[PDB]
Design a protein around this ligand. Structure first.
Ligand SMILES: CCCCCCCCCCCCO[C@H]1O[C@H](CO)[C@@H](O[C@H]2O[C@H](CO)[C@@H](O)[C@H](O)[C@H]2O)[C@H](O)[C@H]1O
Ligand SMILES: CC1(C)CCC(C)(C)c2cc([C@@H](O)C(=O)Nc3ccc(C(=O)O)cc3F)ccc21
Length: 236
């Protein structure tokens, strides 16, 4: 046991909760826009969705800055890491807000969209793949501490191209991995495959983020103007 590792778990856990409300802590509300038929793009939904996505990018940067040692990396590396992992974390976050009973996803202001509305808000051809990933995440029954640590592991990764000090990044990732294994095994000792199953979700997330970036390219041709600036930063 390590006092420092236990403090890291709570630090990351609190950083995640304070930048990402849990599904049960949100007062859900709906909209009746394009609710019953799939269309190429409902502009009203795209406008609201893109605004919510921008707000969450700011929350992810906020979360990153609260991760022990992140602000110790060069600003260039901080930006490189965020640009490389923001969409992965955006995908994990929306998928943790999936309510299977209603086949809905919920945003941080409580906006709860059904599958067709997610499709019409911009997900388009990627809609069902995103919902399937969310469905496959359910069995893991991760809690918020686990989601926060997994997110931190996705972000603090030394394999990202253009890092100035990849070894320093690798060193910062080490305790996050130790923390997640310790926490996960302690919480559910009879399910020892949970830690490796969680780590493999990172590869799935990268796949779904890759497809999300491809969808952003086509979506650009469907919207009247350019995507929100912080979203463009993430996509470059
Ligand atoms: C991957 C793409 C990201 C690449 C990095 C580029 C993004 C850099 C983002 C830094 C964000 C700017 O941060 C600065 O302005 C924000 C918006 O006015 C403020 O954000 C503030 O308001 C938001 C309301 O919209 C709240 O959700 C934030 O929790 C709150 O802190 C910050 O408190 C301030 O520090
Ligand atoms: C790049 C862009 C703008 C266009 C292409 C698609 C539609 C694939 C997409 C999909 C996502 C998705 O990860 C998501 O909805 N994250 C998400 C998670 C939580 C909140 C919140 O808590 O409010 C808001 C969100 F936005 C994010 C951005 C995009």
């Amino acid at each position: 046991l390590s006092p420092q590792l236990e403090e890291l778990i709570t630090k990351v856990s609190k950083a995640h909760q304070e930048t990402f409300p849990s599904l049960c802590q949100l007062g859900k509300y709906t909209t009746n826009s394009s609710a019953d038929h799939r269309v190429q793009l409902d502009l009203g939904l795209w406008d609201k969705f893109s605004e919510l996505a921008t707000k969450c990018i700011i929350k992810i940067v906020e979360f990153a800055k609260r991760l022990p040692g992140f602000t110790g990396l060069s600003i260039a590396d901080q930006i490189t890491l965020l640009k490389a992992a923001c969409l992965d974390i955006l995908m994990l976050r929306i998928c943790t807000r999936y309510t299977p009973e209603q086949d809905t996803m919920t945003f941080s202001d409580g906006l709860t969209l059904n599958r067709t509305q997610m499709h019409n808000a911009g997900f388009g051809p990627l809609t069902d793949l995103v919902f399937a990933f969310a469905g496959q995440l359910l069995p893991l029954e991760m809690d918020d501490t686990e989601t926060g640590l997994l997110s931190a592991i996705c972000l603090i990764c030394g394999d990202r191209m253009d890092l100035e000090e990849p070894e320093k990044v690798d060193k910062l990732q080490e305790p996050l991995l130790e923390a997640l294994r310790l926490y996960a095994r302690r919480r559910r000792p009879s399910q020892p495959y949970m830690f490796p199953r969680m780590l493999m979700k990172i590869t799935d997330l990268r796949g779904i983020s890759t497809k999300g970036a491809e969808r952003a390219i086509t979506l650009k041709m469907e919207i009247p103007g350019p995507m929100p600036p912080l979203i463009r930063e993430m996509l470059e």
